[PDB]
C-alpha cells in the first residue's frame with residue numbers, strides 16, 4: 076500500500092500524448108502520490124530532491140525512489156471491450172462467423188457462468204491475466220447474471236484493476252435458457268449500478284450499461300436504459316455494425332429506423348460515454364451520427380478478422396474526429412493482450428491500405444496511442460489516464476525488453492553497422508513483445524502485478 | 527547423442543497428414559531409431575514391448591522410454607523462407623514497403639554481416655531462437671558473402687537444425703557496397719554448394735541456390751545458376767510477385783518476357799525444387815507455369831501485411847495443386863515463429879474471404895498443415911518430414927499447454943458447462959501459444975533444444 080507515501084519513479088518513460096507521436100523521456104523522474112502524478116522532470120539528477128523541491132512539507136524519509144538500459148515505463152493499456160465471461164472460449168470458434176458463434180459458443184458459456192464457482196475462477200483468471208499483459212483499465216461485458224456481475228465488480232475492486240463492469244441486457248432473440256424479460260433486465264441493471272456505486276464504492280470500479288446489441292434489446296428496454304443512463308450519467312457499451320448478417324437482422328428488426336446506428340440513436344443510447352464496439356460497416360451517415368453524439372469506438376481487430384466480420388476503417392473514423400480505442404473482444408478475439416490487439420490493428424490497417432491508400436495505414440506510434448490514450452478517450456478518462464502527465468493516474472507498466480524469455484532481442488552493436496533508435500526499440504517490443512516483457516503493473520499508483 | 531539407442535516416445539501425437547485433417551493419437555507409442563520413426567502404435571500399453579516386438583534383436587536395456595495431460599508431440603515447424611541475416615531488423619521497417627525497405631534496412635544489415643563476429647552472433651541467435659519456437663527445418667537466405675554463408679552452414683550443422691543455406695546472388699541493381707559481379711556470384715555459389723555438400727557433409731544441412739529476385743540477377747547469372755541447378759540437382763529459392771512496384775520493375779527490366787514468373791522460367795530457375803516466396807500478385811498464367819514446373823510457394827503473411835505487399839491467395843494456389851508452406855520471412859516479417867506465421871496466415875485468409883467467399887478461409891488444421899507438411903512439400907522433403915509416420919524423420923516438438931508462463935489456459939471443468947474437444951485444445955495453442963509452450967525440440971531423433 077503506497078497511500079500516503081511519496082513515490083518517485085526514475086528512468087525512461089514512453090507514452091503517446093498525441094496521435095502519431097511517441098514521446099520518449101530518458102533519465103526522467105515522475106513523482107506519484109496517492110495514485111496521482113505530481114511532476115515529470117526530464118534530466119533529473121536527484122529524484123528525491125525533485126520531490127522535496129515539489130513539496131516543502133516532505134523530508135527525504137517520506138520519499139520512496141523506484142529505479143527503472145533495456146527498460147522503460149509505458150502507460151497501462153486500455154481494453155475498451157472484453158467479454159470476461161467468454162474467456163474459456165478463446166481460440167474456440169472454428170469456421171463460424173458472428174451469429175453462429177453466438178449460438179454455438181457464447182450463450183452456452185455465458186449461461187454456464189451463472190455458477191459462481193466457475194465465474195469466480197474465470198474472473199480471477201482474466202483480471203490477473205489482463206494485468207499481466209499490462210491492461211490497467213478494461214471495460215468488461217459480463218453476462219445477464221446479476222450475482223456474477225457483482226462478483227466481477229468485487230474481485231476487480233479486490234485485485235486493483237481499473238474497470239467498467241457491465242451486466243449484459245438481453246430481453247429479445249436469445250435462447251430461453253439465456254434471456255431476461257424487460258423488467259428484470261432493466262431492474263437488475265439499476266441494481267448493479269447501485270451496488271457498484273454505493274456498495275463497492277471504489278474509484279477504480281465503475282458501472283456501465285450494457286445492451287448487448289440491438290437484436291437482443293427491445294425498444295422498451297433500450298428507452299428505459301437510456302433514461303437510466305441520462306439520469307445517472309452512466310457509461311454505455313454495445314456492439315455496432317460488426318457483421319453483415321447482423322446488420323441485415325437489425326434492419327429487419329427495426330425497419331422504422333434508418334440504420335443500426337439510428338436504432339441506438341432513436342432509443343437514446345448514443346452518448347458522450349457510449350463505447351461502440353467494432354463499427355466496421357458504418358455508412359457515412361452512421362459515422363456522422365456517432366461523431367455528433369460523441370461516442371467512442373472500440374476497435375477489435377482480432378475478432379473482426381477471426382470471425383470474418385470485416386475491416387474497421389480506423390483511419391476513416393479518426394479522420395472524422397471520432398475517438399478510437401482498442402478492444403481485445405474476448406473471446407471472439409483470442410488474446411487478452413492489447414499489445415497483441417495493437418499489432419493486429421497495425422496489420423488490419425495495411426490490409427485496408429492495400430486497396431485504399433497508404434493513408435489508411437496506422438503507424439506503430441498510432442497503434443500504441445490507440446492502445447492507451449485512445450482507449451482513455453473512448454472511456455472519457457483521458458484527462459486522468461493514458462499518459463505520464465501531471466494530474467493523471469499512475470496507470471503504468473514496466474517493460475523490460477530483456478526480461479527472462481524475451482523475444483525482444485538486441486545485439487550490443489546495435490545500441491559502422493546500423494544502430495537502433497529508441498523508436499526502433501519500442502517497435503521491436505510492439506511487434507515481438509508479450510506479457511513476459513511486462514514485469515510490473517501499477518494502477519492508481521499501486522503495484523497490482525509482479526512477474 | 528541418441529544414435530544407436532532405440533527410443534520410444536509415449537503420449538499424445540498430433541500431426542496433419544492431409545490438408546484439413548488434424549490427426550490426434552492419444553496413448554500412442556512412436557519408436558525412433560537413429561532419427562527415423564520405426565513404428566506408430568495407437569493404444570500402446572507397453573512401449574518397451576512395442577520395441578521388442580518390432581525388432582527381436584533388441585532387449586529391454588536397448589530401449590529408452592520417453593514419457594510425454596496437457597501435452598502432446600507435434601511435428602517440427604518448417605520455415606520455408608527466412609533471411610537469418612536480417613534478424614537484427616525484426617520490427618524495424620516503419621512505413622516502408624518492399625523496395626524502400628530493401629534500400630533503407632536490408633542491404634545495410636546484410637552488408638554489415640560481412641563482419642564474422644556479428645554474423646556468428648546473429649546466426650547463433652536465430653538458429654537457437656527458431657529452434658525454441660519449434661522450427662526444425664528452415665530455408666535460410668543469408669547474404670552475398672561466401673565466408674559468412676559457410677559459417678551459417680557450419681553452425682547449423684553444429685546446433686542440429688535441419689537447414690537449406692543459401693548464399694544470396696546479386697549482380698545487378700544493388701548498391702556498390704553490396705553487390706557482386708556475375709562471375710563472383712556464380713563461382714561463390716558453386717563453392718558454397720561444394721563446401722556444404724563435400725566439407726560440411728551433414729544430412730541435415732543442404733545448399734540452396736539463391737538468386738535474390740529477378741531485378742538483382744542478370745540473364746547471364748540466372749542461366750549459369752540454372753545450369754548448376756540442373757547438373758547438381760540443387761534446391762532453388764527466390765522471391766516472386768511480392769509487391770506491385772517490384773512487379774513493374776521486373777516488367778521494365780525483362781520486357782522480352784511475359785511476366786515475372788516467365789523471367790524465372792525462361793532463364794531456367796523454375797524446378798520441382800524451386801521455393802518461390804510470396805507469390806501474391808500472380809496472374810492465372812503465372813500460377814499455371816508454377817504448377818507445370820512443380821515449384822513450391824513460401825507464404826509469408828506477416829511480411830506481406832507489414833510491408834503492405836498484398837494478400838497471398840493461398841486457397842487459390844492450393845486449389846491449383848501448387849504446394850504451399852509457411853515462411854517467417856525475417857526480417858520483413860518480425861517473428862521467428864511459424865506458429866505466429868500460421869496464425870497470420872489464418873487471419874490473412876479471412877481478409878481475403880471478406881471479399882471473396884468463405885472458400886478462401888484456412889482452418890486451424892490447414893494452417894498447421896501449412897506449418898509442417900506444407901513446408902516439407904515445398905522443400906520436397908515430405909516423404910521424410912512433416913508427420914509422425916514410419917520412415918520419416920523424428921523432427922518434433924513437445925507442446926505443454928501448461929508450461930510455465932503459458933497463455934494457453936484451460937479450466938478443469940472444461941476437460942453441464944461446455945467442454946473442450948482435443949481439437950479445441952490444439953486451437954487454443956494455435957492462437958495463444960508461443961515458444962513458452964515448446965519445451966523440447968528434436969531434429970533427426972536428437973534433442974536439440976530444451977526450455
Ligand SMILES: O=c1[nH]c(=O)c2nc[nH]c2[nH]1
Nearest residue numbers: 181287288314378404407
Ligand atoms: O464481438 C462480439 N462479441 C459478442 O459477445 C457479441 N454479442 C453480440 N454481438 C457481439 N460481438
Ligand SMILES: O=c1[nH]c(=O)c2nc[nH]c2[nH]1
Nearest residue numbers: 632738739765829855858
Ligand atoms: O520479403 C523479402 N525479403 C527480402 O530480403 C527481399 N529481397 C528481394 N525481395 C525480397 N523480399
Ligand SMILES: [Zn+2]
Nearest residue numbers: 158314352404
Ligand atoms: Zn464483443
Ligand SMILES: [Zn+2]
Nearest residue numbers: 609765803855
Ligand atoms: Zn524474403
